[PDB]
Amino acid sequence: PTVKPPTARKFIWTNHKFNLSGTPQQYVPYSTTRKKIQEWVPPSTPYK
Amino acid sequence: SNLIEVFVDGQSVMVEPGTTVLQACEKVGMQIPRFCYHERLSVAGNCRMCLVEIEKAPKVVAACAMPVMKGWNILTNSEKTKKAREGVMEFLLANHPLDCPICDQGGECDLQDQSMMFGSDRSRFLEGKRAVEDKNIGPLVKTIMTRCIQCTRCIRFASEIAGVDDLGTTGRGNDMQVGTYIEKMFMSELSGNIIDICPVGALTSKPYAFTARPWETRKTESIDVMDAVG
Amino acid sequence: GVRTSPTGEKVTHTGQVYDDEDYRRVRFVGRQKEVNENFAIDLIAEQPVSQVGSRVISCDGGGGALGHPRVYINLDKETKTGTCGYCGLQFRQQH
Amino acid sequence: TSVKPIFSRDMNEAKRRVRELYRAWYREVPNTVHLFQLDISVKQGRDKVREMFKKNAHVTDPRVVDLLVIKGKMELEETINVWKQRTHVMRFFHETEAPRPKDFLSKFYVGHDP
Amino acid sequence: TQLITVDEKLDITTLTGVPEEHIKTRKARIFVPARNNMQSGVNNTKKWKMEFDTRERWENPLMGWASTADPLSNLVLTFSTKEDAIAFAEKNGWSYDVEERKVPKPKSKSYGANFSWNKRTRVSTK
Amino acid sequence: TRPTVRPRNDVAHKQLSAFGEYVAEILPKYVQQVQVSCFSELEICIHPDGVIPVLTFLRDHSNAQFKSLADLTAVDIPTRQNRFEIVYNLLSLRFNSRIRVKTYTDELTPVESSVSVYKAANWYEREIWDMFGVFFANHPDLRRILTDYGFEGHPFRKDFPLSGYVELRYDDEVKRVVAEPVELAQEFRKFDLNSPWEAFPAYRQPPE
Amino acid sequence: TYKYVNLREPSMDMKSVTDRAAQTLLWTELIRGLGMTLSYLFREPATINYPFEKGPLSPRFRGEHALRRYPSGEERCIACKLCEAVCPAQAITIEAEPRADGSRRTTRYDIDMTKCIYCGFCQEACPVDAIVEGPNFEFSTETHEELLYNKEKLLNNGDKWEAEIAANIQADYLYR
Amino acid sequence: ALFVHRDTPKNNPETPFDFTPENYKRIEAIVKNYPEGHKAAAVLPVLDLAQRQNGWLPISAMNKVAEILQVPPMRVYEVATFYTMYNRKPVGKYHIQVCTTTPCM
Ligand code: SF4
Ligand code: SF4
Ligand code: SF4
Ligand code: SF4
Ligand code: FES
Ligand SMILES: [Zn+2]
């Protein structure tokens, strides 16, 4: 692999981080989605 | 008296005078593949996929609007019927760009279904494929006029039932743009009905545009609200 | 171009960042919220705009049967640039 | 209308079969409740067996009644065997509530459950 | 050979193993499905589809899915006539709501009256 | 029409057609339909009373042996007053052909326990009993194969949904694995694919 | 076309019958089996030094389920839902929205690594080859929840390498 | 080519446009040849008169024709784009047309 080690792109980790699982620092998932239906805001000024 | 006999593939059936071949075929069940006919719109023989062979006729009749004379016999599955359908499907698929993923009528196209069930599979005319830039129709419709197959369904419906009288054909040949020439903001009543009557993905919904796809969603009963017509 | 939420953790390019009351904040206690450091919004802002003097021009994305297929875009408008739905990189004209 | 039945000529043979089967279920309780090493009293299980028999009381056609006799016969076969373990015998019992009664109001709080 | 038979309804509903909660709670709906009006295909007709009523599908709090407690929300049954639907629903017991089949209307169209002389039908552009 | 199209022959077609007509002639008592497939596998649609006479006739009779018993399942079809279909497949040992006996039945009225003529019928029979619910006349053993012992409902039916009504999990409270009602995390998105436009017009049933 | 065996007689001559008697009573061919086992004992075995050597594979091996992106470009996917349309466990879940820039996007791209039967159908169905069957097979996750990849998870997965993936594609774009 | 209007004043009404009352009498002869019921059939001769009065037609010429002939304006746009006489774009006073296709080339 000394013939073509890199590629000429700007996105690549220079680190080559190892198998990051089994650590205190690893992946946990979550739903990547915004607010569903924008629950209703009560009125600001108090009445009576 | 009031009954005209046609032989769809030999089978006799009674047809009222003044009606098309297509209503007879739907009476016996045959869906003739069609693009520019609509069962609630005025008829104009444009799409040419409605061809069928009646025997002892060298030409091929456009059965979208062919009236029914006395005592017919119709070959729905003749060889030149299949040849004509493969040919018209071969003509339509050149100047329609490779947009079926990014289109919004993936499960709800018409070229795709009739090209499967009627057309060829190995294309020709290896280069070409004109590109026509759209207009700014309005906030309600997202508009890509490049996929417009110029089927002239929006224009007929617009000018007759909508009566807005602004969808115009400009030019000739490959250069025939559909729409208002001077980029008027198309704002009128019933202007949202057009996004589904357009049979290809030339027109689509502006909020729905890149959200989902009809094979995921399930279909459910409801009745119209806010209007007492229902 | 990652930002910082008022809670403290990093935002995402999809606008799903947390409130002051979400408990997925408290399930992210102790471990990394693995966010991306590559935002494709500003990489298109890094991309120059080509100037091709022809009328109807092609796009492939660098490779025969590699990347996205042949899409032919139009340049007949004077001021509205030709944007590929697959590439997202615009074009100009030299007439 | 001519339909072949399973076994019987009226409901009398069906009642005969089902009460002989229930007698077999009643005599079949103590050996298996000592063998399976259970923790539920004999009265409770016997009342649940007779309550399960009384659950299907609204059936009058003798074909279906003989079919349920065949069902309970297969059940009593698999329980006179030691094939079934503690799991299915406790699965007849319903200890995993699910507490929702037929109140309208308890159905109002835990919504969408009419 | 022309044996015992008594004529009633059928009692498969105690045999099918579904509890009485989902017997009396959920209700079936029997109809001919809609023509997908963007396309023009009446091939999706001629099929009396039996469906149920949908119920709650809450969000999966970790993944964002349609977390539903509904085993019977994903069934559809294809029938030939309405009589088969009625016999099937009364066979397996739970309640049914049958809608009426609404066919299209054979409507008269003619190119000459489209392009006539003194009528108001004039497309003025084609 | 010549290249890359699956070759068929008229020879096996005419042989099986004449043989099926011959069988229908020599047994006029239970034959209803003798359909010859275009790919030359015979199907014979049959009334459910002389099933054991049919099987004793088809094990033997020296013009076609058919000593091989095979697939049988009463394939779940709704909409019919006679729902289930008992299809006994028979394969010869001397003549190399495949015939299917599709006799019809409904749910409650029993078929007549084909184990008396074929030794390999028993586990197939017990399978169909536990899975569909097809009862038998003078049958040795009806037990449950391929299912749980506490499970019920004949789950292959169109009555039965994708999921069950049971869900096993262990608890330490009552110290066992109990069955609870279903708690699905995923929708099972049923992707509807029934597209229009009638790809096979030759198989169209005549409408009203 | 049949070639059946064991139909040959033992010879009733004294020669072969006492040779079989010598085989029976004298333990000859069992010692010949011992000699066969010793002949394979004096080999050198076909093992591997596992943390140091990694065995042979294919350029078409289907592992990581990683993403790609364009040369100095945007995210490669379209949200055209073909992979979700063909995934045999419905392990794909794509909730999609467009951003305001016009280029069509997503919200949430979801692969159940629990539910993946590792076909290659989502590779062969993607028109731009956004989701790529990966080259390496090292997941070995301690927890259950971490087997549920998200979009930015797969983007950071693709940010560690592409040159391996591009080499496999460059060797494998011509056979398919 | 270039069938977007791309307004760019010298267009974008109001652009001042007019005829002659003598030309109005010409237009009365024009809709005097055609029978009643089809007053819109004179779109082609009236827009021919518009090209005779102005060497290239602007948008306000079409707007004035849409005022006069009780027509929807889009049909006027269609006929203006459709045929070959009506150079909607400015040309010289004289215009040079070199006819050459099959015998001529
Ligand atoms: S309308 Fe055009 S781009 Fe859209 S699905 Fe049909 S053929 Fe494909
Ligand atoms: S915009 Fe649509 S409906 Fe109108 S002509 Fe084009 S393809 Fe037909
Ligand atoms: S097939 Fe490819 S482009 Fe389409 S949704 Fe899946 S990953 Fe995206
Ligand atoms: S390889 Fe995995 S993610 Fe891809 S289609 Fe198959 S099961 Fe689905
Ligand atoms: S329907 Fe399109 S031409 Fe007859
Ligand atoms: Zn591109």
DSSP secondary structure letters along E47-94:
-EEEEE----EEE-TTT--EEE--TTSS--EEESSHHHHHHHHHHH-S
Crossing angle of helices D11-35 and D42-55, rounded to 10°: 150
G92 close to ligand 3 (CB < 6 Angstrom): no
Contact F188 G85 (CB under 8 A): no
Question: Measured between alpha carbons, how far is C74 from B131 in angstroms, rounded to an integer?
Answer: 5
> Does B64 sit in the ligand 5 pocket, CB within 6 Å?
yes
What CA–CA distance (Å, rounded) separates E87 from E10? 9
Residues pairing with B73 in the sheet:
B7
Cβ–ligand 1 contact at B204 (below 6 Å): no
Q: Find the helix packing angle between H43-53 and H59-68, rounded to 10°.
A: 140
Residue G127 CA to ligand 6 center (angstroms) comes to 13
Instruction: Estimate to the nearest angstrom the gap between the alpha carbon of F56 and the chain centroid.
Output: 20
Q: Going by DSSP bridges, is the β-strand pair G92-95/G108-112 parallel, antiparallel, or unpaired? A: antiparallel
Residue bearing tokens 């890199």: A6
* DSSP per position, A1-48: --SS---S-S---SS------SSSS----------SS-PPPPPSS---
User: Quick count: other Cβ atoms within 10 Å of Cβ D110?
Assistant: 9
Strands G66-67 and G131-132: antiparallel
- If DSSP states are collapsed to H, E and C, what string results for H29-87? HHHHHCCCCCHHHHHHHHHHHHHHHCCCCCHHHHHHHHHHCCCCHHHHHHHHHHCCCCC
Residues 6+ apart with CB under 8 A from G87: G119, G121, G122
Ligand 3 center–CA F104 separation, angstroms? 47
CB-CB contact of F111 with D6 (8 Å): no
Q: Does A21 touch chain G (CB under 8 A)?
A: yes
Copy the structure tokens of residue B165: 């009288």
Say how far apart CA E15 and CA F154 lie, in whole Å. Answer: 9
Q: Which of F166, F186, E54, E70 lies closest to G89 in space, CA to CA? A: F186
Token couple for H48: 């021919």
Instruction: Find residue D38's DSSP bridge partners.
Output: none
Residue F197 and residue B33 in contact, taking contact as beta carbons nearer than 8 Å: yes
Which of the other chains make 3 or more beta carbon contacts under 8 angstroms with chain D?
E, F
Nearest to B107 by CA among C71, E47, G80, F190: G80
Cβ distance G155 to C38 less than 8 Å, yes or no, reads yes
Which residues have CB under 8 Å from B143's CB, separation 6+? B134, B135, B136, B137, B202, B203, B204
Residue at H84: amino acid letter: T
Contact flag for D and B (3+ C-beta pairs < 8 Å)? no
Whether there are 3 or more C-beta pairs closer than 8 Å between A and F is no
Which among G74, G95, G128 is the top mutation candidate for probing chain C, defined by the most C β-carbons within 10 Å of its own β-carbon? G74
Helices H21-33 + H43-53 axis angle, to 10: 160
The three-class DSSP label of residue B170 is strand
Give the Cβ contact number of residue C60 at 10 Å. Answer: 16
E16 within 8 A of E38, measured Cβ to Cβ: no
The whole-angstrom separation of Cα E68 and Cα B55 is 59
Alpha-carbon gap, residue F69 to F87, rounded angstroms: 11
C-alpha G85 to ligand 6 mean position (Å): 24
Nearest to G154 by CA among G68, G89, G84, G90: G68
Ligand 3 center to residue C9 CA distance, Å? 30
Gap between the Cα atoms of F191 and F187, Å rounded: 11
Contact residues on chain C for G124, CB-CB shorter than 8 A: none
Comparing C-alpha atoms, which of E111, E121, E40, F204 is closest to residue B62? Answer: E111
Angle between helix H43-53 and helix H73-82 axes, rounded to 10 deg:
70
User: Is the bond preceding B127 in cis, omega lying within 30 degrees of 0?
Assistant: no
Report CB contact under 8 Å: E64, G145. no
- Site to probe by mutation for ligand 3, drawn from G90, G107, G126 as the one with most ligand atoms within 8 Å of Cβ, is G126
The per-residue b/e assignment along E110-120, b for 16 or more CB within 10 angstroms, e otherwise, is bbeebeeeeee
SS3 of residue C28 by DSSP = coil
Q: ω into residue D98 within 30 of 0, thus cis?
A: yes
Task: Locate the chain E residue with the closest alpha carbon to B109.
Answer: E39
Beta strands per DSSP E along B67-190 = 72-75, 141-143, 168-172, 175-179
Which H, E and C letters describe chain F, residue by residue? CCCCCCCCCHHHHHHHHHHHHHHHHHCCCCEEEEEECCCCCEEEEECCCCHHHHHHHHCCCCCCCCCEEECCCCCCCCCCCCCCEEEEEEECCCCCCEEEEEEECCCCCCECCHHHCCHHHHHHHHHHHHHCCCCECCCCCCCCCCCCCCCCCCCCCCCCCCCCCCCEEEECCCCEEEECCCCECCCCCCCCCCCCCCCCHHHCCCCC
User: Nearest Cβ partner of F184 from E18, E67, E92?
Assistant: E67
Q: Say if G and H touch: at least 3 Cβ pairs within 8 Å.
A: no
Cα–Cα distance for residue pair D94/D104, rounded to 1 Å: 23
The H helix count followed by the E strand count for chain E is 3, 6
Chain A neighbors of E59, CB-CB under 8 A: 31, 36
**Alpha-carbon span D86 to D88, nearest angstrom:** 6
Rg of chain C taking only CA atoms, in angstroms: 20
| Distance of CA B105 from the midpoint of ligand 1 (Å) | 6
Which residues on neighbouring strands pair with residue B168, listed in sequence order? Answer: B179
Residue position matching structure tokens 């007709």: E45
| Furthest CA-CA distance within chain D | 52
Instruction: Please state, in angstroms and rounded to a whole number, the distance separating the CA atoms of residues F88 and A34.
Output: 58
Nearest Cα residue in chain C from A23: C31
Find chains touching chain G: ≥3 CB pairs under 8 Å: A, B, C, E, F
Calpha distance F69→B178 (Å, rounded): 67
- Whether residues B133 and C76 touch (CB distance < 8 A) is answered with yes
For ion ligand 6, residues whose CB falls within 5 Å: C 59, 84, 86-87
Two tokens at G132? 């790529």
Closest CA to D44 of D94, D88, D81: D94
In G27-120, alpha helices (H): 29-41, 82-86
CB-based contact (8 Å) between D68 and chain E?
yes
Going from the C-alpha of C86 to that of each of C37, C82, E38, F1, the distances in angstroms are 22, 12, 26, 40
Domains of chain D, by residue range, sit at 1-114
**Chains contacting C (3 or more CB pairs within 8 Å):** A, B, G, H
Chain H positions in Cβ-Cβ contact with residue E117 (cut-off 8 Å): 37
Rounded-to-integer distance, Cα B29 and Cα B27, Å: 5
Q: Which residues of G touch A30 (CB under 8 A)?
A: 150
Q: Hey, is the C-beta of B139 within 8 angstroms of any chain G C-beta?
A: no
Decide if A43 touches E, using CB distance below 8 A: no
Helix or strand run (H / E) with residue C50: strand C50-51
Among the listed residues D45, D71, D76, the one whose alpha carbon sits nearest the alpha carbon of residue D56: D71
Sign, Cα dihedral of B161, B162, B168, B169: negative
Across the interface, which of H1, H7, H77 has its CB nearest the CB of B168? H77
Size of interface B-H (CB pairs under 8 A): 41
User: In a 3-state reduction of DSSP, which class is residue B179?
Assistant: strand
Range of the domain at C4: 1-95
Burial of F24-37, coded b for 16+ CB within 10 Å and e otherwise, reads eeebeebbeebebe
Sign of CA dihedral G83, G86, G89, G93: positive
**CA of B101 relative to ligand 3 center, distance in Å:** 9
Q: How far is the CA of B210 from the centre of ligand 4 (A)?
A: 23
Distances (CA, A) of E103 to C5, E23, E83, F195: 58, 32, 18, 19
Q: Is the CB of G111 under 6 A from ligand 4?
A: yes
Q: Which residue of G has its CA nearest to E62?
A: G145
E19 contacts F187? CB cut-off 8 A = no
User: What contacts D5, CB < 8 A, 6 or more positions away?
Assistant: D62, D63, D66, E3, E4, E5
Restricting to F residues 148-207, those with a Cβ less than 8 Å away from any Cβ of G are: 186, 188-189, 191
Residue F203 region, left (φ>0) first, then alpha (ψ -120 to 50), else beta? alpha
Test E16 with F194 for CB contact under 8 angstroms. Answer: no
Nearest CA to ligand 4 atom 6: G119
Nearest Cα to F204, choosing from E7, B31, B160, H57? B31
CB crowding C12-46: b at 16 or more within 10 Å, else e:
bbbebbbeeeeebbeeeeeeeebbbebbbeebbee
d(CA B73, CA G80): 46
Contact in structure between F70 and F58 (CB atoms under 8 Å): no
Q: What are phi and psi of F128, to 5 degrees?
A: -65, -30
| Long-range contacts at G88-95 (CB < 8 A, ≥ 24 apart) | G88/G117, G88/G119, G88/G121, G89/G115, G89/G116, G89/G117, G90/F186, G90/F188, G90/F189, G90/G115, G91/G115, G91/G116, G92/G122, G93/E63, G93/E65, G95/A33, G95/E64
**Where along chain E do its domains lie?**
4-126
Instruction: Return contacts of E95-98, CB within 8 angstroms, 24+ apart.
Output: E95/E24, E95/E27, E95/E28, E96/E27, E96/E28, E96/E29, E96/E30, E97/E27, E97/E28, E97/E29, E97/E30, E98/E30, E98/E31
**CB atoms E4 and D68 under 8 Å:** no
- Nearest residue (by CA) to ligand 5, atom 4, is B64
Element (H, E) at C51: strand C50-51
For D107, counting Cβ atoms within 10 Å of its Cβ (0-12 exposed, 13-18 middle, 19+ buried), the class is middle
Strand partners, B61: B52
- Any residues with CB less than 8 A from the CB of B24 and at least 6 apart, and which? B6, B8, B13, B15, B68
DSSP states of G120-176? SHHHHH-SS--EE--S------SSSGGGEE-HHHHHHHHTT-SHHHHHHHHHHSS--
Distance CA E28, CA E26 (A): 7
- Among left, alpha and beta (phi > 0; psi -120 to 50; other), residue C62 is left
Q: Estimate to the nearest angstrom the gap between the alpha carbon of B198 and the chain centroid.
A: 8
Residue count (chain A): 48
Alpha helices in chain B, H assignment, sequence order: 21-28, 79-92, 111-118, 154-157, 194-197
Beta strands in G46-138 (DSSP E): 66-67, 92-95, 108-112, 131-132
Among residues G129, B103, A10, the alpha carbon closest in space to that of C68 is found at G129
Beta strand spans in chain B (E): 4-8, 11-15, 51-54, 61-62, 72-75, 141-143, 168-172, 175-179, 203-205
Number of domains in chain C: 1
